[PDB]
Amino acid sequence: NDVKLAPPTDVRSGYIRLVKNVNYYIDSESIWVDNQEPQIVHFDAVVNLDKGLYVYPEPKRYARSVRQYKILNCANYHLTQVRTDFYDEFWGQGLRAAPKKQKKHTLSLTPDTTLYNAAQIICANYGETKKAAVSELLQASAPYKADVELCVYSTNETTNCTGGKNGIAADITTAKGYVKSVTTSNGAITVKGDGTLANMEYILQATGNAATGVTWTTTCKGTDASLFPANFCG
């Protein structure tokens, strides 16, 4: 038949308008992310209709809303529509029409696209640190500093306080996390960052001995040395 609907004027809790169409909502409560793929955001869009769609076995029953299951890749702004469901109540609830085949399709959300700003917002909230990374870079030298001090008290010199000698652990030459490498030579521990910290490096140098006192200097290098914590760099 032909039924005219009056879509709800007030926004239901958990739904939000982010596009020109006031009857098209993002269902905030539906949003989920798998932490193993942290830039891939799963969500439903919901449209409240202004005319019923007769898509049920019973010829008098009609849909009042549509729920579209979407996947947004925040790394490349690709948006995939996965499934479309028709519901007999507003807000994508109630009895669901029989499933139809979705021509699964993906598109790139460039700045002219209707959903571009909605995607920016979804990504800001769900699609994904630096201080914790820098802390790990600092912690990398800790075991080596301890090893070098032990060496200096035992041997009475900084010469030969080198990785793989005098109880000093071997140099780390395999990148792991934010640490590219840790090397120790003659009382100098050189730490280089990796990835986001690739432009950060520091050198901890031991000088002296028991009688003079064992002193440490910290020298920082790299274009991003400004990211080191207050008072760290000498």
Numbering used by the authors: 8 to 135, 145 to 250
What does the paper say about this structure?
The construct produced in this study was a fusion protein composed of a large part of the PE sequence, a hinge of two glycines, and a large part of the PilA sequence. The crystal structure of the PE-PilA fusion protein showed that most of the protein was visible, except for three small disordered regions comprising the first seven N-terminal residues (in the PE domain), the linker region (residues 136 to 143), and the C-terminal His tag. PE-PilA also crystallized in space group C2 and had two molecules in the asymmetric unit with a noncrystallographic symmetry dimer interface (area, ∼450 Å2) via the PE domain of the fusion protein C terminus. Interestingly, crystal packing analysis revealed a crystallographic 2-fold PE domain dimer, very similar to the one observed in the isolated PE crystal form, with a comparable dimerization interface area (∼870 Å2). It is unclear whether this crystallographic dimer represents the biological dimer, but it probably represents a favored interface in the crystallization process. The PE and PilA entities of the PE-PilA crystal structure have tertiary structures that closely match the isolated PE crystal structure and PilA homology model, respectively. In addition, two disulfide bridges in the PilA domain of the fusion protein that corroborate the mass spectrometry data were revealed; one (Cys167-Cys177) links the N-terminal α-helix to the intervening loop of the first β-strand, and the other (Cys236-Cys249) links the final β-strand to the C-terminal loop. Only the N-terminal hydrophobic α-helix tail was missing in our tethered PilA, but this tail provides both an anchor for the globular head and a hydrophobic surface for the assembly of pilin subunits to form a pilus and as such seems less accessible to antibodies than the globular head and, thus, less immunologically relevant. We observed a more substantial crystallographic symmetry dimer interface (∼870 Å2) in PE-PilA via the PE domain and one of ∼890 Å2 for the isolated PE (excluding the C-terminal His tag). Interestingly, our PE dimers were generated at pH 4 to 4.5, close to the side chain pKa of the key interacting residues Asp52 and Glu54, while the published structure was obtained at pH 6.0.
In the present study, a vaccine antigen based on the fusion of two known NTHi adhesive proteins, protein E (PE) and a pilin subunit (PilA), was developed. PE is a ubiquitous NTHi antigen described to be important for the adhesion of the bacterium to epithelial cells. It is also known to bind vitronectin, which protects the bacterium from complement attack, and immunization with a fragment of PE was shown to afford protection in a mouse model of pulmonary clearance. PilA is another ubiquitous NTHi antigen described to be a conserved protein among H. influenzae isolates. It is the major subunit of type IV pili (Tfp), which are hair-like filaments involved in adherence through ICAM-1 (25).
